[PDB]
Amino acid sequence: ASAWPEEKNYHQPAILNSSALRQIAEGTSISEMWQNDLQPLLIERYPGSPGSYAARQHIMQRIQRLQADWVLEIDTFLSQTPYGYRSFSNIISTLNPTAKRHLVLACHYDSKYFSHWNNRVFVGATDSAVPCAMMLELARALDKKLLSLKPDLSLQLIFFDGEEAFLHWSPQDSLYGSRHLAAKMASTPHPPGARGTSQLHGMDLLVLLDLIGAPNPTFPNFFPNSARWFERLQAIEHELHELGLLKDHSLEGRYFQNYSYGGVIQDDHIPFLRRGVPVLHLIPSPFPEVWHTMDDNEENLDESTIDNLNKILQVFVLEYLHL
Numbered sequence: 001a002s003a004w005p006e007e008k009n010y011h012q013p014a015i016l017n018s019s020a021l022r023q024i025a026e027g028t029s030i031s032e033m034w035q036n037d038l039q040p041l042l043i044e045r046y047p048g049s050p051g052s053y054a055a056r057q058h059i060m061q062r063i064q065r066l067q068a069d070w071v072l073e074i075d076t077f078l079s080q081t082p083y084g085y086r087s088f089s090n091i092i093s094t095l096n097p098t099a100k101r102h103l104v105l106a107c108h109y110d111s112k113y114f115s116h117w118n119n120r121v122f123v124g125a126t127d128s129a130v131p132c133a134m135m136l137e138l139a140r141a142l143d144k145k146l147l148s149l150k151p152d153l154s155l156q157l158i159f160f161d162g163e164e165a166f167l168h169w170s171p172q173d174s175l176y177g178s179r180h181l182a183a184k185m186a187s188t189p190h191p192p193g194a195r196g197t198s199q200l201h202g203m204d205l206l207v208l209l210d211l212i213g214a215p216n217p218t219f220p221n222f223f224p225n226s227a228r229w230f231e232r233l234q235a236i237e238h239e240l241h242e243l244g245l246l247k248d249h250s251l252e253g254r255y256f257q258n259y260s261y262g263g264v265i266q267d268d269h270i271p272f273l274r275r276g277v278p279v280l281h282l283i284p285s286p287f288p289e290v291w292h293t294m295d296d297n298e299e300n301l302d303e304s305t306i307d308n309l310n311k312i313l314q315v316f317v318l319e320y321l322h323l
């Protein structure tokens with residue numbers, strides 16, 4: 001009876017030296033992400049809308065053009081909603097599908113439904129078009145390194161549909177995509193042919209990005225079972241800062257501070273966390289001031305903060321994967 005599902009508990013990062021950190025900082029482009037990955041998503045894209053389809057096509061096309069061996073799957077399903085039965089489509093992009101373990105980065109790609117108000121449309125810039133674009137830019141910036149994966153551990157990206165409630169949040173009206181996919185993964189043997197382990201046992205850590213893009217975010221260290229990885233984010237931020245590789249950044253105003261948050265925040269990680277998956281929840285507290293407002297738009301995004309977080313996240317992923 002293999003103990004491979006316990007490997008995540010002992011897994012250590014292979015830390016990047018200064019020259020490597022400079023390389024990663026120089027290898028990501030916030031302007032290229034802005035134009036090529038973010039702007040196409042700054043559209044109305046609630047579940048079932050034409051924008052949802054356009055966003056899904058955009059995400060798939062951007063991953064498909066990369067050199068690394070990404071396997072794309074669209075997870076389409078039905079769920080009851082306040083408006084009756086509807087269809088949803090999660091997007092899953094995986095390197096090395098049969099590898100037993102994967103580090104998983106995720107966000108939601110739907111935008112919350114609002115009827116147009118005074119010619120304004122809700123595009124959820126921080127919620128979560130930026131997180132989507134950050135995952136796409138990470139796949140692009142790290143493409144050559146990721147191509148080398150073509151330690152039975154690889155990378156998976158999940159873009160969840162239906163994170164938002166169609167009305168105001170309620171237990172049944174929210175997290176459509178993640179509740180569905182967590183249950184599906186929990187009931188899927190992994191690796192292929194396994195007798196008693198599932199795709200959830202294979203999830204080393206779920207890094208969920210949400211509500212990113214506003215100025216001065218502060219991310220709490222939510223869970224004891226992922227605290228050591230939160231500490232790695234702190235260390236990476238600190239070293240990138242000291243090497244002069246972050247923009248308009250101070251340690252007093254750092255993003256990963258020493259502070260927990262005992263409360264519960266409902267988000268896409270919940271169906272995974274309640275099935276035992278370790279989660280690093282990259283959601284700020286407090287939420288952006290523009291949260292669930294028509295002002296959650298492009299103009300209110302903080303470019304340098306997103307650039308800095310892209311560098312931090314890319315170093316984190318390379319260190320985790322030993323790349």
Ligand SMILES: CC(=O)NCCc1c[nH]cn1
Binds near residue numbers: 127210211264266267
């Ligand atoms: C308020 C709460 O507990 N969860 C909502 C988090 C959220 C809203 N939009 C994106 N993420």
Ligand SMILES: [Zn+2]
Binds near residue numbers: 112127164292
């Ligand atoms: Zn939201």
